[PDB]
């Protein structure tokens, strides 16, 4: 219940604490009064507890304060957070609630180390390393609070002092939304007096037709509006990916249209939640494969006036000036949301435990520890891969394997793939480029109902570690079907050599 | 590393051994000789390993054989398969092979408690509720060896004896694969008289020519060869899902069509592995959405014979007697191979650790006791979900939670959607079905390289446990993106009720 290792004794312990609009002066006079008092040690995470609950998605952020405890504070490291666990671990009272406890003498005694008071800590979140603090509100009174930030403070439009903040956490999409916000209403309005855009507006039948003569239509708007010299980088950085196609553009503003009614056009709050749960707003970001594409200020204003444009014309073919208002207020907010999750240290697809997503199928390390090659010794390790299928009945072609002589050869006899539970030996060989092939020695397939363990066993003759000069890649690759140049679909399992 | 709990003595203690062809006579006369014996306390598992080795994928079959041990044998239940941990933990010799120190009289009487020798236990495989047993060598001269099943005996076509067999572990998909031969081979025969089908075989090609005017032209003998009074009842089962369409049925025998040279044609080990590795072998199947829908001998028989009237199609077009002889052959062991998938124990979709993939979303339950939601005591449990997405940025609306007043309620302080390390909190309302409906209080959206933890945590007032009939579903629902009739892309996990 307790991780002794993670707990320690510190003098001026600090911590910091979201603070909502209204309550960052207020807070800093004391911590007063929601069962207990919460803290982190990234004030980073903090500033996301800082939006008005009456308004969690579009609201005005508050700031962050930092809070220190005078003295001594002993850190309490948690294995589990459930009190009733907890309670029972410890040879607590299990009556009594577990904070109320925390805060008396007798508890302090015990577990303070000589500490003048204790406070609990647990990892913040899967996948951040933060950790978050549990402070008792009795003991909480003798923190002193100092400002770190105040949101409100730095007169900056909707959410964008907060999440430029948190932007500094990576040194990195680090935009000035200010001029991105100056140069969007610049283009949408030099957009609508262009000749070339009035002529098509007025091509336009201004008047509730079907869905399919819609998107028609907006594909031509569409194609005409990139022309405009003032999105001329745009139709550079968009002419090739799909994701980015006039057809993407104009599926998302059809839909736009179709979700958003007069009440809901007039909240802001009400139109990011509306906004907020369609699909295809990766089209507009120019957000594919893992990477955002638009990340300088100039591509990202482009886009979004092109796409306030286009909203513009669907409303009358298949749903004001919600276009060039409340949708381009709130499609910021939906951008520097999704920018800071791609600012965020996170593992791609095919790494620890992520699955990795392709052609149908998907698969991963089944564990973290499976993702991790040991070297440096002599013996055998064994590395579990879970694979399935989205639907229809698809091929494991094998599989493709890093292999050093000595320091890592595949142990042929241990290595083999199950198939709802049938136990498939394979077949292995050495090609062409340090690398060795696995074929079952029976067809899988996997599919809805059908999923695969495949087991990699290494065995290591030699006890000298692998240098990463020796490794010619860092992934595993299943292949599965086949598809005048014939290639299979690759999938694959990203691995780490440690010790 | 060693399980007491599943270890045990046992008197006349039997197991099984796949026997490969040219061996199921000799083999009965004792057990010689690779470094270790292996059998199986499943009878149809050790079927599996009873084809040729030089022709594993479509050769013969030799049979199953049943070893004994007389007076007692001592099991040992092995908690890891790694030598080397096993020879430290126990304080072997780290230096003698272990299954050899196994067979030693000193290993005997320290382990065997009384028995006569000791055989070490494995968990068969992933996904399967089946043993292995590693037997020394020495010590397997002991086995008195009788025959189980022989199928070479049973003298029927390809590996139709092993499967029939095999399917007779679930008492179900059970086929006279016998029946579906001869009905193949006569309506492939009355197919190729037709007068409306001869007729669209004199209007093609009958050339090298582009792959989609092969496509085009297989489609539309498709149409026409689907009319034939012979394959009546596949024209209706196959009329509505579009996996089972003609479009479908033609993508297949042009693939077919572009793998198969001479060589390949004329080895029916080489023709496996190459058909093996195609996409699309669901439409012919009549396998889709987790079911087997072709399950009788008359529509099983119908759809191979219409395939391989394409497939001799699609040869001249794209790229001999294969299509009738060596393709229905080998498509014929593909069939059986997934129909023994599907007849064996799995979990479906959104079940224990199995992902739900859907909409391009991954869902799945982090670890299995997630998916167990224990009853009959009060307090709190903890369940988390694993949640990202193929591609683009796609939004997670929020989660519908089954909830029972008092035995089962939402704990709304602990739940909560964390998106790269970044925590969200959620709103959470009862709603119309007895459904507890939450929302994050940010967007979330997950991709690639964008994941989320769904953390629900439950709350428990009463210590009564919830009976089987006060909870409407058995599933968490997420919520994806919403596509006049709104509705959400829905994301399955479901539960156990235990304890």
Redesign the interface.
């Known amino acids: 219940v307790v991780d002794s290792s993670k707990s320690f004794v510190m003098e001026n312990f600090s911590s910091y604490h979201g603070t909502k609009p209204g309550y960052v002066d207020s807070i800093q006079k004391g911590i007063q009064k929601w069962k207990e008092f919460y803290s982190t040690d990234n004030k980073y995470?903090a500033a996301?507890?800082s939006?008005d609950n009456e308004n969690?998605?579009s609201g005005k952020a508050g700031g962050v304060v930092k809070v220190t405890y005078p003295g001594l504070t002993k850190v309490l490291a948690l294995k589990v957070?459930?009190?009733?666990t907890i309670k029972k671990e410890l040879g607590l009272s299990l009556t009594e609630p577990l904070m109320e406890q925390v805060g008396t003498e007798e508890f302090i005694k015990r577990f303070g180390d000589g500490a003048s008071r204790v406070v609990l800590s647990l990892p913040?979140?899967?996948?951040?390393?933060?950790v978050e603090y549990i402070n008792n509100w009795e003991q909480a009174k003798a923190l002193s609070v100092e400002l770190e930030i105040n949101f409100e403070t730095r007169g900056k439009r909707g959410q964008d002092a907060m999440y430029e903040y948190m932007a500094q956490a990576c040194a990195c999409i680090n935009l000035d939304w200010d001029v991105i916000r100056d140069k969007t209403k610049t283009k949408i309005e030099s957009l609508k007096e262009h000749g070339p855009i009035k002529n098509k507006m007025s091509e336009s039948p201004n008047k509730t037709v079907s869905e399919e003569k819609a998107k028609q239509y907006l594909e031509e708007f569409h194609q005409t509006a990139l022309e405009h010299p003032e999105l001329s980088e745009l139709k550079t950085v968009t002419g090739t990916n799909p994701?980015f196609a006039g057809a993407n553009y104009a599926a998302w503003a059809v839909n736009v249209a179709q979700?958003i009614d007069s009440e809901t056009a007039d909240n802001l709050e009400k139109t990011?939640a509306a906004l907020?749960?369609?699909?295809?707003?990766?089209?507009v970001?120019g957000?594919?494969?893992?990477?955002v594409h638009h990340n300088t200020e100039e591509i990202v204003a482009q886009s979004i006036a092109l796409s306030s444009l286009m909203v513009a014309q669907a409303i009358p073919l298949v749903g004001i000036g919600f276009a060039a208002y409340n949708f381009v207020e709130s499609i910021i907010?939906?951008f520097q949301?999704?920018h800071?999750?791609?600012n965020?240290?996170?593992?791609?697809?095919g790494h620890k435990?992520?699955?990795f997503?392709?052609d149908g199928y998907?698969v991963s390390w089944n564990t973290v520890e499976d993702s991790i090659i040991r070297t440096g010794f002599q013996?055998?390790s064994?590395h579990?891969i879970?694979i399935?299928?989205?639907?229809?009945?698809?091929?494991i072609?094998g599989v493709l394997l890093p292999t050093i002589p000595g320091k890592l050869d595949v142990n042929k006899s241990?290595t083999?793939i199950?198939?709802?539970?049938?136990?498939?030996?394979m077949?292995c060989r050495a090609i062409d480029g340090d690398v060795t092939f696995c074929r079952p020695?029976?067809?899988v397939?996997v599919?809805?109902?059908?999923?695969?363990?495949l087991?990699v066993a290494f065995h290591r003759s030699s006890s000298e570690k692998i240098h990463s000069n020796e490794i010619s890649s860092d992934s595993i690759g299943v292949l599965g079907?086949?598809?005048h140049t014939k290639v299979?679909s690759k999938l694959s399992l990203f691995f780490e050599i440690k010790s």
Chains 1, 2 share one sequence.
Do not use: C, W
């Open positions: 995470d996301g507890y939006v969690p998605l957070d459930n009190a009733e913040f979140a899967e996948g951040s390393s933060s994701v979700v990011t907020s749960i369609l699909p295809g707003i990766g089209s970001m957000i594919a494969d893992g990477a907010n939906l949301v999704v800071n999750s791609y965020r240290p996170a593992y791609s697809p435990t992520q699955p997503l392709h998907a013996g055998e064994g579990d879970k399935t299928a989205e639907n229809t009945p698809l091929p072609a241990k083999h199950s198939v709802n539970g049938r136990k498939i030996r077949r020695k029976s067809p397939y599919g809805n109902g059908v999923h695969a363990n087991h079907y086949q598809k299979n």
